[PDB]
């Protein structure tokens, strides 16, 4: 009874597959007006704790604007270092992770905190395999899996600079 | 391996648990007028084929109104052009996720796998609602395998519910 399989497939079939194909084009139009990354960075906190505002999780992550255009709203966030803009990217949480959290607060589910973490890892692996064989192929999508004990802004910044490195070497 | 498990739990955790608790109150406030049923009837077509308009599936199923808040819609059921029943009718949306996977070659999801997961989705959702407080027996599942009148199949369940109520 692996609930992550359904959550991952539904997350790709019902959401990721419908916003990723034209994601770059929306970013390119924005970048015509600083610069924004080309990929959608999805945060996968293995504790399955998704706050309503990303600014709370890390003070160095601050809202900048929403990416201009079923229709779904993605928003561009800027990451800070000593109060200075070190990176800006489209950041969003893995929404199915809250479904794992709500199940663990549902006594009739039998979902323990250990089961939630275990399913969170399965959700991350399955989405990886899905996107790997996917037309978007993570070419517009990066997966951020992190287990809080940690600067979240530093972890996304590390991947952003690596993406820029790849963009100029390859 | 079984993708229906996630779809069922997500459908209950992310949707059913948030509309079912107050469903009767919204229907009761609506039912103040025209002094209909108290349950949410979910259609589970085992073909995983969800039309955009329910009127197409059966011409005897017609839209009447949307349940006002305190989005679900109230449908009217016909028999020989006469209204024989009125209820809040809706599809099990995760069934389209099963259909889209069957049209995704990279998934490895065959038409036989779609039916198997559709049946598993129905059984799993049944057990979930059985042990659920929010269910309150205000939600009934209509599972039907197309070969049958869908309007008649729902009608059979509405009259049974009224029978039990008295």
């Amino acid at each position: 009874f692996n609930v992550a399989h359904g959550l991952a497939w539904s997350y790709y079939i019902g959401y990721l597959r419908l916003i990723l194909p034209e994601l770059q084009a929306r970013i390119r139009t924005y970048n015509q007006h600083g610069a924004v990354s080309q990929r959608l960075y999805i945060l996968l906190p293995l504790d399955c704790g998704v706050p309503d505002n990303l600014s709370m999780a890390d003070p160095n992550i601050r809202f900048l604007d929403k990416l201009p255009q079923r229709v779904y709203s993605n928003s561009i966030y800027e990451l800070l270092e000593n109060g200075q803009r070190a990176g800006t990217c489209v950041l969003e949480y893995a929404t199915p992770l809250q479904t794992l959290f709500a199940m663990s607060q549902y006594s009739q589910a039998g979902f323990s905190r250990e089961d939630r973490l275990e399913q969170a890892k399965l959700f991350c692996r399955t989405l990886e395999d899905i996107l790997a064989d996917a037309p978007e192929s993570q070419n517009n999508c990066r997966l951020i899996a992190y287990q809080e004990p940690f600067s979240l802004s530093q972890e996304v910044l590390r991947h952003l600079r690596q993406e820029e490195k790849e963009e100029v070497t390859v | 391996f079984n993708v229906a498990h996630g779809l069922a739990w997500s459908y209950y955790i992310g949707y059913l648990r948030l509309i079912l608790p107050e469903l009767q109150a919204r229907i009761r406030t609506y039912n103040q007028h025209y002094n209909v049923s108290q349950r949410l009837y979910i259609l589970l077509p085992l073909d995983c084929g969800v039309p955009d308009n329910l009127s197409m599936a059966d011409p005897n199923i017609r839209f009447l109104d949307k349940l006002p808040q305190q989005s679900n819609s109230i449908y009217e059921l016909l028999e020989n052009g006469q209204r024989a029943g009125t209820c809040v009718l809706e599809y099990a949306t995760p069934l389209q996720t099963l259909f889209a996977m069957s049209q995704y070659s990279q998934a490895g999801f065959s038409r036989e796998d779609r039916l198997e997961q559709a049946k598993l989705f129905c059984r799993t959702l049944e057990d979930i609602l059985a042990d659920a407080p929010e269910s309150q027996n205000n939600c009934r599942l209509i599972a039907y395998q197309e070969p049958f009148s869908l309007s008649q199949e729902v009608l059979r369940h509405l009259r049974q519910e009224e029978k039990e109520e008295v």
């Binding site: 019902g14 959401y15 929404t95 | 949306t93």
Partner: peptide, 7 residues
């Protein structure tokens, strides 16, 4: 509907 994820 099933706009479970952000919209």
């Amino acid at each position: 509907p099933w706009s479970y994820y952000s919209y």
